[PDB]
Scaffold this active site. Structure first.
Site, PDB file in Angstrom:
ATOM      1  CG  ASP A  61      -7.074  -3.544  -9.996  1.00 55.27           C
ATOM      2  OD1 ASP A  61      -8.223  -3.084 -10.157  1.00 55.27           O
ATOM      3  OD2 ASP A  61      -6.419  -3.382  -8.946  1.00 55.27           O
ATOM      4  CB  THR A  94      -6.791   1.393  -8.633  1.00 57.49           C
ATOM      5  OG1 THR A  94      -6.899   0.456  -9.711  1.00 57.49           O
ATOM      6  CG2 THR A  94      -7.729   0.978  -7.522  1.00 57.49           C
ATOM      7  CB  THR A  95      -5.721   3.219 -13.760  1.00 60.91           C
ATOM      8  OG1 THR A  95      -5.661   1.798 -13.599  1.00 60.91           O
ATOM      9  CG2 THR A  95      -4.650   3.653 -14.741  1.00 60.91           C
ATOM     10  CG  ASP A 391     -11.969  -3.701 -10.051  1.00 59.52           C
ATOM     11  OD1 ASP A 391     -11.561  -3.870  -8.883  1.00 59.52           O
ATOM     12  OD2 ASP A 391     -11.250  -3.236 -10.960  1.00 59.52           O
TER      13      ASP A 391
END
Ligand SMILES: Nc1ncnc2c1ncn2[C@@H]1O[C@H](COP(=O)(O)OP(=O)(O)O)[C@@H](O)[C@H]1O
Ligand SMILES: Nc1ncnc2c1ncn2[C@@H]1O[C@H](COP(=O)(O)OP(=O)(O)O)[C@@H](O)[C@H]1O
Ligand SMILES: Nc1ncnc2c1ncn2[C@@H]1O[C@H](COP(=O)(O)OP(=O)(O)O)[C@@H](O)[C@H]1O
Ligand SMILES: [Mg+2]
Ligand SMILES: [Mg+2]
Ligand SMILES: [Mg+2]
Lengths: 528, 52, 535, 532
Positions: A61, A94-95, A391
């Site tokens: 994550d 989130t990346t 997630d």
């Protein structure tokens, strides 16, 4: 510079201004993006970070990795902040937010170096972001049928897509079915605390189970607990917040007697108070007794003599989940233990799970809560499994709110890049270069997917561009076949809000970084 | 090979046998060259310089 | 290749991004994976010598100088002071295998090390580690299905315990208690079969009290169908042996009552003092009479008592023991079939437990005494009393008996078995190799690497037994292929046959499946890490 | 596993490190490019102050540790040595090329493909420059040299006084013209002696029609001015004779000692008597002269100068027609001096320059020489004057040797960028990208020029590119190849008409050297730093 006998600011104040400081900010953002770059896609990898105490965290994550890094650069902290914001609002991507923000900054760096005014860049970013968000809302695929089977398939596909980048990607279908089953039982608020997650060492990933009810670990049983039966076939559950043991009646209470008869009467009165509470509990018909407060040995033996189950010091969240699963109410007083406040379940059982005892409440037909029991070989294994499941759960909740999807694998971003390039071809030309740079920066995610998977990113990007130019909205990256494919027909589905929030946050971060021209650092106080 | 339980003397003799067979194979793949053939010399020099 | 990155800007201005970035190391890409594989291989090669009947022990010293000699892989890895993160991952893998199964904590580490060793040469040829992990998962699924196919079912009836005893003997073969091998297997099997819910339910391991005392001989270890207690009779002149004891289990100290609430009793005259003294004396007499009225022969308390109660107990021919721990109270109540009574006024004849013999046991010239409660009617709790020549062998016997009890518990959970000695590993490797010949070429390398890693267990077993690893493993594999017999394994004990079925080398199918699954998942987890950010 | 006592960086890390070092070196001097660039003032650890605009001087004075940065500094030094101008431009171009090449490499483009594309782009750029952008100076006359000097001296301390300094430079260069074998005229710059003296303004700097010596007469009794000079150049000292190591004087009869001691100086007396008897008026020697010989020259009424530098003496001797004599020995074994060894000049004067005196040899015969005396406010300003003057002299020499010039102001860079961007589409598939990046990186020069003037760099570069694209596409718009940048007004301008010229050699050599340096740095993908 001159000594200036009395200085303006105190000694140690560092100031950086002009084009060089903003170029440095862009470079720092590039470093931060590179720190999490490799963890994107089905061929992504995990990062291991060791803290000062020596504990290590292993995660794919992006938000977790960025939080674990002690980033102190003021401009680089914005990427961590937008990663946290994307995690909070959406839970996935989130990346991509960090990659997109850093790519925007990298693409506009050459124009910064040549003296272009930052306000023009900010205006171009805002225009491009608005156009891209509108395009996403326009081309996102939704079904106006409200079919239960179709909705279930959409949720499962979105969950598998959200899960196909983690260590549990091999069992992604199984875990996605579990996640969709768990989310669909929440009633209307989709509270995360109504989905318990227990991690038990030992067992394979496929051994993890979803309990249609509530399950929690054994809580410090007293003597005589082993004399109690451990299985009931239709138990009534007494959910209490009561301390069931001999104790002082009140902290400030004082007893004053002047007769041995009164002394014996007081002792018998304490015993009678405890036994009256126990008898009121027993006469309610309940066979399982759970308390948020400690249950003493005397009460445990009393319940054992009556073939009843007791468990004190149960965590509050577990009691709330048990209440939601069974249908009772947590009672602080046992004076009115009517049938309306007693929980019901079909089967209660205490079983062994990898060298640990767990209490199981199954058979609940009206349950509004679940409990994941994750199995793994190590603490970090189960922690990363929990992160991946979180997630997936967030993605499924967002899709429950609205069933608007776009094809993944970079297809949506290639379509957005083509649209933005087409728009930029029809404007004066100062904004045209910046909007074209925005469109080019939109290509980072498919390129990063190809790089992580070990392909040649240039040829795949050329094929994707040619396909999108000649028609075909949902053509992305085919990781298994090392080629391109219709990702919508391949069920690489994402909720539209994921990409919408990603673009919005990345654009806001890029504009904020560009808008800063001077950095001032006051000297540290109380270094100790 | 050592983890499999083979003494490092059977390994050495087997490597010597394989080396002899490989020398035979490489000689079988050879092709006679004359110093008057300038094209072959140029090709060899270009191949040597290709990696620099 | 460390320290991260350092540029200090292309303008000469300071460039600080991460706190203490100059004191933090970083490994990236294939180098970090190579280092992780090296560390895991070192751990696995250290552990692989302790595999099989001919495996050797490790003498472990903690930070306080205490010495532990053991063969259990989980214990060795837990006590080993590692600093590498991958080593901690292997330690946790062993701990998880111990938790779920209880046996095979050494095979998982060797298997994981072999898998990573093969993955190293796979990576050197330019294969993505995710592809290697996917191939490993596919081969693990194939091997698990084959294990299900070639398993056999045993009877877990109390009437015939021979397969259970054979399985326990196979578990204990690699331990130091192989001198008392059959006796240890028998006592473990009987202990598990006693404290067990017959309808394939759980086995509560805290219903077995495993306690050891130094002195005597290892052969003196016995299974007591009752409770052994580290206490003795409260009065020195009390009788040391009670027969047909009717036990009164009590959790109230034999003392005058006192309320829990803050209380003050006021003495305002001589009459009050006399009444208080009479009340105390009458309370002592009344509690003793109440205990005696139920017909009990023995009294067991948890919180001790004072001199007057002790002398009244001695005077009324009521042997008593005080300060018995809570778990011991519960075990005594369970074994004797009696209820735990919180006060004397609630004591009745129906709440009394029964024991055929309560005795106080001496241990030579040691002054220490212990109490034995046994000969119960239908005792549902057992205790294992271990003797030995030193505390190290006693601790190792405790660990070995725990392994045997866990194995029989697994057999209770699932009654399907496979034959050890590497026979199951060889059969699974053959199945994986045969399946690899059908799949597309790219995953063939990963599946064949998995088969090679599976074949390390028979090779390690043969090497520990002194015979040539590769030759013996090849001969056994060829025999397995020729004649369809997945029970042919390594003849570690040199019994003249390779048939593990005849040698009764039996291990649980669930244990092997857990071994393969845990090793595969942990190898996948290790293969996916590409960055390290130690401070 | 390696167990090497050192640090190892591999791949993207070392590539980015090298690019960062090169970019830092470039950014150091990027502010000193073009007529709107500004000088830098460097201070040593001992307090010495250097104010300069030259890239080579800045990079030489800087103390550099990174190997790639050292490569760039040596590239600047080599460009200074082989051309004399374009020292900042070559460094900037090389760093931009390296940055764009690394950007390509980060996209999984193999470095060999980038190197091949860079080589092809450099070859085609040189060919296009030689075939389209060169201007023959035959049709421009003397004004071409003046314009080239003016362009070179822009951005220097002598830029505003260029109207005067360009004439001075052109006259100085033309004064030292000679033709060697094959009939090719040659211009030996560095034969123009440059003397720096603080004092009067810049506009009162002098160009000497002869030679200027940083020396004074040996004795105060000598005349300070000789009209018809007969210069004798000697390469030996005029002192009391001393025997060598292998010869010893041993006296047994005391009566011989006085004769020995007398001859010990009579030898030098006779040598000086011969030299003066040939008719010489001025005597210059690289060795020392002691008091006795100085008095001989004083009585003779002649000028004698001692400790003359060897290069100065050689230049004076060849300009005046004299011959350097390391000994008065002929082929007959005798000691003679002939009048044919005497140089001639129209005047030799010791003039005063700011409370100090120097010797001027005016109007040497049989050859014309040139010297320049620079007047400034202080020493640092005179040093910067000398550096700028050397740059201008080198530029004029390059223009006169090779009679081709190219327009300045970034016109060449824009034309090359357009042409190479068009040409990349006809070569390969990834070397196509490499050539495109070469063309894009060539635009760093006009961008930096516009940035230094605080002008709109984006809009000006876009206008320049549009003009050059129209020139290349349209066939009758070939006159737009000369459109460059006018930094004073921030508008495109026909630089060929405006007089902004450069020698073609500057651009060609800068391109070749920058390409080679970029290839060399791009060739690295692993660094092992052994511990000292
Ligand atoms: N099966 C798949 N095929 C191709 N691309 C995929 C697939 N699954 C996910 N992706 C892509 O991987 C990208 C990153 O997703 P992931 O790594 O799961 O989370 P994050 O967005 O936080 O990095 C997404 O943009 C998605 O388009
Ligand atoms: N009598 C025997 N003959 C051959 N092999 C045996 C025998 N007993 C045990 N083994 C093998 O030794 C291996 C290791 O067992 P052991 O050391 O007892 O526990 P662990 O599996 O934790 O190492 C098992 O896989 C088993 O097949
Ligand atoms: N009068 C002028 N007008 C416009 N541009 C000029 C003028 N003089 C010089 N330039 C340009 O400025 C650039 C920088 O020259 P400069 O940096 O001073 O020389 P160097 O590169 O040798 O240090 C040159 O490429 C030249 O084309
Ligand atoms: Mg995701
Ligand atoms: Mg074992
Ligand atoms: Mg110049």
């Amino acid at each position: 510079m001159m000594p200036t006998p009395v200085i303006l600011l105190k000694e140690g104040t560092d100031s950086s201004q002009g084009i060089p400081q903003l170029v440095s900010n862009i470079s720092a953002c590039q470093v931060i993006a590179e720190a999490v770059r490799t963890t994107l896609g089905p061929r992504g990898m995990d990062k291991l970070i060791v803290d000062g105490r020596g504990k290590a965290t292993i995660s794919n994550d992006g938000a977790t990795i960025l939080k674990l890094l002690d980033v102190v650069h003021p401009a680089a902290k914005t990427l961590v902040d937008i990663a946290k914001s994307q995690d909070a609002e959406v839970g996935d991507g989130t990346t991509s937010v960090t990659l997109l923000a850093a790519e925007f900054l990298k693409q506009v760096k050459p124009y910064v170096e040549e003296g272009l005014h930052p306000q023009i860049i900010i205006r171009a970013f805002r225009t491009a972001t608005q156009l891209a968000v509108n395009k996403i809302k326009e081309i996102a695929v939704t079904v106006k049928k409200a079919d239960k089977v179709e909705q279930r398939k959409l949720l499962e596909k979105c969950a598998m897509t959200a899960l196909s980048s983690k260590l549990i990607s091999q069992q992604k279908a199984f875990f996605a079915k579990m996640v969709v089953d768990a989310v669909m039982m929440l009633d209307d608020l989709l509270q995360l605390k109504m989905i318990g997650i227990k991690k038990v060492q030992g067992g394979a990933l496929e051994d993890s189970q979803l309990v249609a009810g509530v399950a929690f670990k054994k809580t410090f049983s007293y003597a005589g607990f082993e004399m109690q039966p451990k299985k009931y076939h239709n138990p009534k559950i007494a959910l209490l917040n009561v301390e069931l043991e001999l104790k002082a009646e009140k902290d400030n209470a004082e007893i004053r007697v002047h007769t041995v008869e009164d002394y014996q009467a007081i002792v018998d009165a304490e015993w009678n108070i405890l036994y009256d509470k126990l008898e009121k509990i027993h006469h309610s018909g309940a066979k399982v007794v759970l308390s948020k407060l400690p249950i003493g040995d005397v009460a445990t033996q009393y319940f054992a003599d009556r073939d009843m189950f007791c468990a004190g010091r149960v965590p509050e969240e577990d009691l709330k989940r048990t209440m939601m699963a069974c249908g009772g109410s947590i009672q602080t007083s046992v004076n009115a233990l009517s049938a309306d406040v007693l929980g019901r379940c079909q089967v209660f059982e205490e079983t062994q799970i990898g060298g640990e005892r767990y209490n199981f409440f199954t058979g609940c037909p009206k349950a509004k809560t679940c409990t994941f029991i994750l199995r793994g070989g190590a603490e970090q294994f189960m922690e990363e499994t929990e992160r991946s499941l979180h997630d997936a759960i967030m993605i499924v909740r967002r899709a429950i709110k609205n069933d608007s999807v776009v094809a993944g694998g970079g297809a949506i971003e290639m379509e957005l890049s083509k649209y933005l390039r087409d728009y930029s071809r029809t404007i004066p030309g100062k904004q045209q270069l910046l909007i074209g740079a925005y469109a080019k920066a939109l290509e980072i995610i498919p390129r990063q997917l190809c790089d992580n998977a070990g392909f040649d990113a240039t040829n795949i990007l050329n094929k994707l561009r040619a396909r999108h130019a000649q028609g075909g909205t949902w053509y992305g990256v085919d990781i298994n076949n090392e080629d391109i494919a219709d990702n919508f027909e391949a069920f690489v589905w994402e909720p539209a809000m994921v990409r919408i929030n990603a673009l919005t946050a990345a654009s806001e971060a890029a504009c904020l970084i560009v808008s800063v021209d001077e950095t001032i650092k006051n000297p540290r106080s109380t270094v100790d | 090979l050592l983890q499999k339980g083979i003494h490092p003397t059977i390994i050495s003799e087997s490597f010597q046998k394989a080396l002899e067979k490989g020398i035979e194979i490489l000689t079988d793949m050879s092709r006679p060259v004359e110093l008057s053939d300038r094209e072959t010399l140029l090709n060899s020099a270009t191949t040597s310089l290709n990696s620099k | 290749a460390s320290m991260g990155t350092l540029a200090f800007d292309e303008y000469g201005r300071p460039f600080l991004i991460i706190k203490d970035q100059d004191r933090k190391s970083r490994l990236m890409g294939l180098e970090a994976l190579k280092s992780h594989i090296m560390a895991a291989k070192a751990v696995a090669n250290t552990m692989r010598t302790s595999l099989g009947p001919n495996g050797l022990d490790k003498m472990m010293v903690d930070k306080d100088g205490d010495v532990t000699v053991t063969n259990d892989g989980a214990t060795i890895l837990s006590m080993m002071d590692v600093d590498h993160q991958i080593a901690k991952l292997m330690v946790e893998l062993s701990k998880s295998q111990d938790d779920e199964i209880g046996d095979g904590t050494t095979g998982v580490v060797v298997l994981a090390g072999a898998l990573l060793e093969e993955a190293e040469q796979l990576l050197d040829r330019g294969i993505h580690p995710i592809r290697i992990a996917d191939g490993y998962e596919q081969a693990a699924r194939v091997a698990i299905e084959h294990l299900d196919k070639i398993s056999d079912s045993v009877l877990v009836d109390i009437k015939d315990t021979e397969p259970l005893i054979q399985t326990a003997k196979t578990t204990l073969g690699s331990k130091v208690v192989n001198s008392c091998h059959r006796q240890m297997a028998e006592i473990a099997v009987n202990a598990v079969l006693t404290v067990a819910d017959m309808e394939r339910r759980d086995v509560d391991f805290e219903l077995i009290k495993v306690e050891g005392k130094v002195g005597g001989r290892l052969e003196d270890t016995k299974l007591i169908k009752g409770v052994i207690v580290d206490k003795d009779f409260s009065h020195p002149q009390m009788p040391k042996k009670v027969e047909d004891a009717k036990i009164a289990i009590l959790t109230c100290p034999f003392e005058p009552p006192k309320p829990k609430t803050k209380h003050k009793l006021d003495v305002t005259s001589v009459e009050d003092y006399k009444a208080l003294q009479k009340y105390e004396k009458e309370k002592f007499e009344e509690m003793i009479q109440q205990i005696k009225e139920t017909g009990a022969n023995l009294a067991i308390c948890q919180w001790g008592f004072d001199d007057e109660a002790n002398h009244l107990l001695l005077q009324n021919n009521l042997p008593a023991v005080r300060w018995v721990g809570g778990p011991e109270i519960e075990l005594i109540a369970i074994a004797t079939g009696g209820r735990i009574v919180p006060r004397f006024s609630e004591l009745t004849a129906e709440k009394l437990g029964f024991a055929g013999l309560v005795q106080e046991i001496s241990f030579g010239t040691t002054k220490d005494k212990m109490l034995v409660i046994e000969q119960c009617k239908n005792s549902r709790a057992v205790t294992i009393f271990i003797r030995g020549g030193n505390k190290m062998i006693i601790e190792e016997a405790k660990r070995s008996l725990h392994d045997a009890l866990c194995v029989i518990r697994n057999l209770i959970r699932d009654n399907r078995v496979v034959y050890g000695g590497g026979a199951a590993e060889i059969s699974c490797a053959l199945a994986v190799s045969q399946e690899a010949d059908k799949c597309p070429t790219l995953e063939q390398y990963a599946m064949r690497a998995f088969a090679d890693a599976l074949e390390v267990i028979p090779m390690a077993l043969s090497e520990n037994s002194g015979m040539n690893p590769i030759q013996t493993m090849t001969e056994v594999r060829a025999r397995q292929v020729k004649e369809m017999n997945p029970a042919l394994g390594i003849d570690c004990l040199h019994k003249g046959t390779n048939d593990m079925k005849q040698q009764h080398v039996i291990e649980t199918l669930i244990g092997k499946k857990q071994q393969i699954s845990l090793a595969t998942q942990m190898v996948r987890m290790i293969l996916k890490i590409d960055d390290i950010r130690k401070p | 596993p390696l167990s090497v006592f050192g640090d190892r960086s591999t791949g993207e890390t070392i590539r980015s490190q090298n690019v960062m070092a090169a970019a830092s070196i470039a950014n150091i001097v990027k502010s000193s490019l073009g007529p709107v660039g500004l000088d830098k003032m460097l201070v040593d650890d001992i307090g010495d102050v250097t104010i300069t605009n030259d890239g080579a001087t800045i990079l030489k004075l800087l103390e550099v540790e990174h190997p790639a940065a050292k490569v760039l500094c040596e590239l600047a030094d080599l460009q200074d040595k082989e051309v004399g101008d374009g020292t900042t431009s070559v460094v900037i171009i090389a760093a931009e090329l390296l940055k764009n090449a690394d950007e390509l490499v980060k996209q999984k483009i193999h470095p060999t493909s980038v190197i091949s594309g860079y080589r092809l782009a450099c070859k085609e750029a040189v060919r296009y420059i030689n075939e389209n952008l060169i201007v023959n100076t035959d049709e421009l006359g003397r004004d071409c040299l003046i314009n080239a000097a003016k362009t070179s001296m822009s951005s220097k301390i002598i830029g505003i006084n260029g109207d005067f300094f360009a004439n001075m430079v052109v006259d100085a260069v033309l004064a030292i013209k000679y033709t060697d074998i094959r009939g090719q005229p040659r211009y030996p710059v560095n034969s123009v002696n440059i003397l720096k003296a603080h004092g009067r303004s810049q506009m009162e700097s002098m160009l000497i029609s002869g030679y200027a010596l940083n020396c004074v007469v040996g004795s105060q009794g000598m005349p300070k001015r000789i009209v018809n000079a007969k210069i004798a150049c000697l390469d030996f000292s005029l002192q009391k004779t001393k025997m060598k190591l292998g010869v010893q004087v041993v006296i047994t009869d005391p009566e011989k000692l006085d004769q020995i001691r007398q001859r010990e100086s009579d030898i030098t007396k006779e040598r000086i008597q011969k030299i003066l008897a040939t008719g010489a008026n001025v005597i210059l020697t690289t060795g020392g002269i002691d008091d006795m010989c100085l008095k001989y020259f004083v009585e003779a009424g002649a000028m004698a100068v001692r400790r003359v530098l060897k290069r100065d003496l050689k230049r004076i001797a060849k300009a005046s027609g004299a011959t350097i004599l390391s000994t008065l020995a002929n082929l007959e074994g005798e000691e003679t001096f002939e009048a044919a060894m005497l140089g001639q000049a129209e005047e030799v004067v010791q003039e005063r320059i700011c409370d100090d005196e120097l010797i001027l040899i005016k109007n040497t015969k049989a050859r014309t020489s040139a010297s320049i005396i620079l007047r400034g406010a202080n020493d640092f300003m005179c040093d910067e004057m000398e550096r700028s003057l050397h740059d201008a002299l080198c530029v004029v020499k390059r223009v006169l040797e090779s009679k081709s010039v190219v327009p300045g102001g970034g016109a060449v860079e824009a034309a090359l960028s357009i042409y190479l961007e068009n040409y990349a589409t006809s070569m390969g598939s990834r070397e196509q990208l490499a050539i495109a990046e070469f063309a894009r990186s060539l635009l760093v020069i006009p961008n930096t020029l516009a940035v230094n003037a605080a002008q709109d760099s984006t809009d000006l570069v876009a206008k320049l590119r549009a003009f050059h694209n129209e020139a290349q596409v349209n066939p009758e718009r070939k006159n737009l190849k000369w459109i460059g940048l006018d930094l004073s007004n921030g508008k495109p301008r026909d630089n060929k008409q405006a007089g902004v010229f450069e020698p073609t050699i500057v651009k060609v050599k800068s391109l070749k050297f920058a390409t080679e340096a970029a290839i060399t740095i791009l060739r690295i993908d692993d660094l092992i730093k052994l511990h000292p």
